[PDB]
Design a protein around this ligand. Structure first.
Ligand SMILES: Nc1ncnc2c1ncn2[C@@H]1O[C@H](COP(=O)(O)OP(=O)(O)OP(=O)(O)O)[C@@H](O)[C@H]1O
Lengths: 95, 302
């Protein structure tokens, strides 16, 4: 794709059954903020829409990336960032 | 290093005695229910902020603490640098807008504090590395708001004091070369030494301590913070062994390269963790995502 600066991402996502290392991984809830690793960048992602395999996240900090790039997803669990799954960008709102 | 030395480094313990030489700050004790929210062990929700047809989470709301924080922010000029008793959320810079610790509202602060592991440590492990048999003292937790400053890069230094003697000065951003530091190395060391003698020495609550300074665009030295003289504080270009071991930190130099024997050791970076801040506790992202695919397949089976 073309590298652009995105403020919102539509993604395919996939969650683990359990955390690594075991507590089960809650489904995505709207308004929770996840840590998103995109390449060598990290940013926040507020969950704003959810389907079984598809999600939307509004970014706390815009990021330069591209459609089709894969991302890692982390949730705050007992005051630590913990990997819950990964995703891939299908679409995004850009500025 | 006793628990008493960690107590002395709380912002509110020392700020009243050094107001005139540090950044103007406001200190707000944390309400019990704001502290419970920051201690929440679940997922992060921020307080105070294709056909798509799921839970919707809300955070607790603190209307009166929000307005009390807003008034304190406006009293500092509208922009503040936040911290807790000891730590700033420097490790959560990546989550904030513009990757900046600058805050204008309480919800800006909340997003940083709930994403920061340094903040988590202030709540859960303040007295680790303490070699003390006594029970842990009860902490009164406080929100520290400091007037925001545009700091010049490479003007921060860390100063190690042992029995009221300045024994070492380390460049703070020691993993990054700044040409102008070696050019001004004598001017910097002497400004720090004079500052320490007039405004620091014999005035802190302990003989052994660490203090951080900023030297502004005009050469004026400002105090930033006090940190315990022990393993909890990053030793930067020193090791705690040589700082503790009453050796000569200045090294092996001749009468040509030599300065006064009383001068502390000044270490800056020559011609040449921070990245785990933005990475999770598990930790290119290509091999990582290949690993999550694998783990996802293995958990389904067993
Ligand atoms: N008023 C301010 N405005 C802007 N940036 C600031 C301000 N005060 C401090 N900083 C920045 O934040 C950093 C952390 O400052 P400070 O020493 O208060 O934090 P800390 O968490 O106690 O320190 P450390 O983790 O190094 O022990 C400084 O090195 C500086 O870059």
């Amino acid at each position: 794709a073309l590298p652009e600066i995105f403020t919102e991402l539509e993604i395919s996502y996939f969650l683990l059954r359990r955390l690594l290392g075991a507590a089960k991984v809650q489904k995505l809830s709207k308004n929770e903020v996840l840590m998103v690793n995109i390449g060598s960048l990290s940013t926040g992602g507020r969950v704003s829409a959810v389907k079984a395999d598809l999600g939307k996240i509004v970014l706390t900090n815009p990021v330069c990336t591209e459609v089709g790039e894969k991302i890692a997803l982390s949730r705050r669990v007992e005051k630590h960032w913990r990997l819950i799954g990964w995703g891939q960008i299908r679409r995004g709102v850009t500025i | 290093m006793k628990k008493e030395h960690v107590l002395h480094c709380q912002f509110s313990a020392w700020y009243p005695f050094f107001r005139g030489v540090t950044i103007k700050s406001v200190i707000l004790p944390l309400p019990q229910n704001v502290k419970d929210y920051l201690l929440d062990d679940g997922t992060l929700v921020v307080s105070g902020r294709i056909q798509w047809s799921t839970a919707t989470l809300t955070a607790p709301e603190f209307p009166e603490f929000a307005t009390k924080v807003q008034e304190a922010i406006n009293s500092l000029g509208g922009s503040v640098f936040p911290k807790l008793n000891w730590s700033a959320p420097r490790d959560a810079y990546w989550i904030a807008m513009n990757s900046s610790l600058k805050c204008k509202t309480l919800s800006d602060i909340f997003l940083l504090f709930k994403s920061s592991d340094f903040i988590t440590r202030d709540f859960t492990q303040p007295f680790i590395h303490c070699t003390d048999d006594s029970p842990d003292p009860c902490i009164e937790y406080e929100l520290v708001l400091r007037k925001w400053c545009e700091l010049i890069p490479g003007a921060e230094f860390r100063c190690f004091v042992k029995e009221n003697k300045l024994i070492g000065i380390s460049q703070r951003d020691y993993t990054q070369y700044y040409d102008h530091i070696s050019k001004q190395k004598e001017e910097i060391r002497r400004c720090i030494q004079d500052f320490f003698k007039k405004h620091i020495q014999y005035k802190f609550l302990d003989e052994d301590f660490v203090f951080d300074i900023y030297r502004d665009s005009r050469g004026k030295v400002w105090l930033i913070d006090f940190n315990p003289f022990g393993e909890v504080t990053d030793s930067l270009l020193f090791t705690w062994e040589e700082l503790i071991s009453e050796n000569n930190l200045n090294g092996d130099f001749s009468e040509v390269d030599a300065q006064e024997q009383d001068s502390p050791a000044f270490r800056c970076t020559n011609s040449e963790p921070y990245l785990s801040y933005r990475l999770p506790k598990d930790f290119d992202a290509h091999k990582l995502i290949d690993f999550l695919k694998l783990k996802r397949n293995q958990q389904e089976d067993d």
